[PDB]
Design a protein around this ligand. Sequence first.
Ligand SMILES: Cc1c(CN2CCN(C(=O)C3CCCC3)[C@@H](C)C2)cc(F)cc1NC(=O)c1cccc(C#N)c1
Length: 255
Amino acid sequence: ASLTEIEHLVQSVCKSYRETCQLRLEDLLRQRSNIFSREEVTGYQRKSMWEMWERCAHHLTEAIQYVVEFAKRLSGFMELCQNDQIVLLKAGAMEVVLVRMCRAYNADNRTVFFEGKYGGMELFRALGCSELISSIFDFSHSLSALHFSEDEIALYTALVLINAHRPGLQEKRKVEQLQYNLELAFHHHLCKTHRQSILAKLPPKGKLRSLCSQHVERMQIFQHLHPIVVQAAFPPLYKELFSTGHKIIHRLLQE
Ligand SMILES: Cc1c(CN2CCN(C(=O)C3CCCC3)[C@@H](C)C2)cc(F)cc1NC(=O)c1cccc(C#N)c1
């Protein structure tokens, strides 16, 4: 790629992201005074572990589905073979969702948007995975310290997804070339806006992987203790991507 095509790639990624956000950033910031009362928080904490897991699993499936659309809209992704399309989504989808969580994070009061209002991490105590919750909140705290623009989150999450080191890629070189162009795009936009300082502050790739594997771990614990719940009440896309016990992704991609 030459320079003018890199700048074209920057706009293409920013637009693909814009069209595939679960909510506009405005909508998330207009709601910041809308906070769960002490009684609604006690309601969340008195809920059973399995109902809370189901409501979070449902919420994650919606977020993941917008990430699939982002991938379908992302320049060059549909050109990869279906096997690498699925390998990339299987590994990266939760990661992009983890990065995207910071838009719904309010670092003043340390609350997150969840089912219509903002609450702190004590909302999720019924999950019984307080370590993972703390890590997500801290991760989201770190990303918010960097004051990402929407364009930056667009470019960063594109690289989070288009990772040519994912085990199982059949056209590894074709993914590396796409990855290189997106990296060029990202770094060009950072340079043009005088934001290269954030390069040293981005989370290591082992942190995003750590959060994901912890998600799979705590969920496998939960599913062991409640196997019918996951079978009966968890969204199919969520079970495919994560549980012990490629086809919904297949159809999401075909459509
Ligand atoms: C809810 C939320 C948490 C809390 N966290 C606990 C449960 N979860 C798990 O993974 C649990 C850990 C293992 C199983 C479930 C996450 C889903 C969420 C942190 C955070 F930083 C942001 C959010 N909310 C959003 O990001 C959000 C919500 C609605 C719309 C949009 C948009 N656009 C974004």
